[PDB]
């Protein structure tokens, strides 16, 4: 009872991530430390500096702090000057305490003053309909959005002076576009902070052909994307069968898309809500169901799988 | 247009409030000011001083701030004393902008933005099952909970050295008992902030004979109390009658208590689930609906009110 878990996450874990914030808290792999709840920060940095390949002056800790809009992002440590604070206190009594560990490769890490801000750059690609992590960036707050564009272009492997559209990933389901690039970061972003995320893409008529042209639309898609498991009632011990749907979808839409997978009519399907989580089918869905898929999967606990049972109907008696 | 509403609410409006936070947002009375969005704060203080009838030195503004934890509380003024800062800037574009106004007699003590905290004091009376506003206090953060107990007794009209059980009203349906009284304020409370509320009661076995022995039970009970209005779907304008229920109630309970009010059997009543966002009934509601009344009504807004239709039948 006198120890705590400190979890370290490193920037490579942010690569390939396709959702909101930097990584998926469940699926990411952490580097873990048992630490005395009365430990010193310098004492932890020492242990960390030996365990990892990096010296103390080539690393920087950004504790992963939750925010009031439901986001969890790298934040600034509240050390600075005469602190002498204890680990468990620095964590505000959180245990485990997760921390983003900034290092360098392949030299010394820059200095960070507060008139500076750390930002995270993501590049949305409407062709592939995927996000591409482009690292992070120290910059004075006084700097103007236009002055970052070369670094976004470069990091996304674009030619210089490629025309880009910039959004701020604010929270899940809110991606505000940055309108005027000729203002400073504090004015350009909604509420400037060190975890803030600019997503960017090419301004190009060629990406109107794609399923989701703008980043803003992409995040709206992810927000509603949900993967449901379809099991046949007449076949007991059936695993499924997994389909990707929206909360938004109504009965016809759910029906026609499951039908385009089972290779049958949507009129020959008979679904059953529901179980959260007293597993097993229940009331059969009338095909005039006025609700939507969000309503059908309402009773499920958050970290549980979504199962809906179905039945194939006869086409001749 | 280039004008914003600024609603002042005075500490007299917190008295008798029987729920979470300081006042009922709907039922409270405001003094309303219409101000240029570009005004100085100085100008507002001048006109507020003129209107309300207090000198600028006897007043203090605590803008009300709606939180994502489900509470609205007084907050420290933002002004970086006071680099321009227009009123609409100070409100984060919020229109209207509500502000708790602190006066004095019917002078005001200095408050260190960095080292002092303003806390609110409620007293729960388990006998009557009622909350009693006991005002607000300025205290150092370093100060220990132990040292506020005398003040809590005084304001509730208790004798000194009266035993008290302390809670923090964190948010609706969350009232955390304070265990150690010999720690600082910042240690004792969850996230110390101006506008934090601690509720206290006598430590007396007598009140265990109450239907709701503690504040914890009281607020939990309040979270569940919910009013819903029932109307006949066939086919008038709206013969509305609203009856008090719990959020914990399942189908049987809600039916048996609405059927009893109409005089019929529950088997005669057919509830239709509220379409939600859309206009009318639509769906019929199954009598084997395994959910609660909380689940039936989570479509309805926070305004709100709560209502759902029925044939009878």
């Amino acid at each position: 009872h006198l120890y705590m878990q400190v979890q370290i996450v490193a920037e490579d874990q942010f690569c390939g991530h396709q959702g909101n914030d930097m990584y998926d808290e469940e699926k990411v792999k952490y580097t873990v430390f048992k630490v005395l709840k009365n430990s010193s920060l310098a004492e932890f940095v020492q242990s960390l500096s030996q365990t990892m390949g990096f010296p103390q002056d080539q690393i920087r800790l950004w504790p992963m702090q939750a925010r009031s809009n439901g986001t969890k992002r790298p934040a600034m440590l509240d050390n600075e000057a005469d602190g002498n604070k204890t680990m468990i206190e620095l964590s505000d009594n959180e245990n485990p305490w997760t921390i983003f560990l900034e290092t360098v490769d392949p030299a010394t890490l820059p200095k960070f003053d507060d008139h500076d801000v750390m930002l995270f750059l993501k590049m949305y690609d409407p062709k592939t309909r995927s996000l591409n992590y482009c690292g992070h960036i120290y910059t004075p707050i006084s700097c103007k959005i236009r002055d970052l564009l070369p670094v976004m272009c470069d990091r996304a492997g674009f030619i210089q002076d490629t025309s880009l559209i910039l959004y701020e990933e604010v929270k899940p389901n809110l991606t505000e576009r940055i309108q005027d690039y000729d203002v400073s970061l504090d004015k350009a972003l909604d509420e400037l902070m060190d975890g803030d995320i600019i997503v960017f893409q090419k301004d190009d008529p060629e990406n109107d052909n794609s399923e989701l042209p703008t980043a803003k639309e992409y995040f709206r898609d992810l927000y509603h994307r949900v993967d449901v498991i379809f099991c046949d009632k007449t076949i007991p011990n059936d695993p499924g069968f997994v389909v990707t749907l929206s909360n938004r979808m109504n009965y016809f839409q759910v029906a026609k898309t499951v039908a385009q997978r089972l290779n049958t009519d949507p009129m020959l399907l008979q679904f059953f809500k529901s179980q959260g989580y007293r597993d097993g089918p229940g009331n059969p869905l009338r095909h005039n169901y006025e609700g939507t898929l969000r309503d059908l999967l309402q009773f499920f606990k958050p970290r549980q799988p979504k199962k809906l049972y179905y039945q194939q109907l006869k086409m001749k008696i | 247009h280039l004008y914003m509403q600024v609603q002042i609410v005075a500490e007299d409006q917190f008295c008798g409030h029987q729920g979470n936070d300081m006042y009922d947002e709907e039922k409270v009375k405001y003094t309303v000011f219409k101000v240029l969005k570009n005004s100085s704060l100085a100008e507002f203080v001048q006109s507020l001083s003129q209107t309300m009838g207090f000198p600028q030195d006897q007043i203090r503004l605590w803008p009300m701030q709606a939180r994502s934890n489900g509470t609205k509380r007084p907050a420290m003024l933002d002004n970086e004393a006071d680099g321009n800062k227009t009123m609409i800037e100070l409100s984060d574009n919020e229109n209207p902008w509500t502000i708790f106004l602190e006066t004095v007699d019917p002078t005001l003590p200095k408050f260190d933005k960095d080292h002092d905290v303003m806390l609110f004091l409620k007293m729960y009376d388990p006998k009557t099952r009622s909350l009693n506003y006991c005002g607000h206090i300025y205290t150092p953060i370093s100060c220990k909970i132990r040292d506020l107990l005398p003040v809590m007794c005084d304001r509730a009209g208790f004798i000194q050295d009266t035993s008290l059980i302390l809670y923090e009203e964190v948010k609706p349906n969350l009232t955390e008992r304070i265990q150690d009284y010999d720690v600082s304020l910042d240690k004792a409370l969850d996230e110390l902030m101006d506008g934090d509320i601690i509720v206290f009661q006598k430590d007396d076995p007598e009140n265990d004979n109450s239907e709701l022995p503690t504040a914890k039970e009281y607020f939990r009970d309040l979270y569940h109390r919910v009013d819903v209005i029932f109307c006949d779907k066939t086919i008038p304008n709206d013969p509305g009658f609203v009856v008090t229920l719990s959020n914990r109630m399942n189908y049987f309970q809600v039916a048996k208590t609405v059927a009893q009010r109409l005089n019929t059997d529950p088997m005669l009543l057919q509830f239709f689930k509220s379409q939600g966002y859309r206009d009318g009934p639509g769906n019929p509601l199954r009598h084997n609906y395994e959910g609660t009344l909380r689940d039936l009504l989570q479509f309805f807004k926070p305004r709100q009110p709560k209502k759902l239709y029925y044939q009878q039948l």
Binding site: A66, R67, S68, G70 | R67, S68, N69, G70, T71, D114, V117, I141, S142, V170, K171, L174, S184, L185, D186, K187, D190, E191, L192, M193, D194
Partner: peptide, 11 residues
């Protein structure tokens, strides 16, 4: 000992 700036225990 200092005051927090923002809350955290959400709806």
């Amino acid at each position: 000992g200092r005051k927090r700036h923002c809350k955290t225990k959400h709806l």
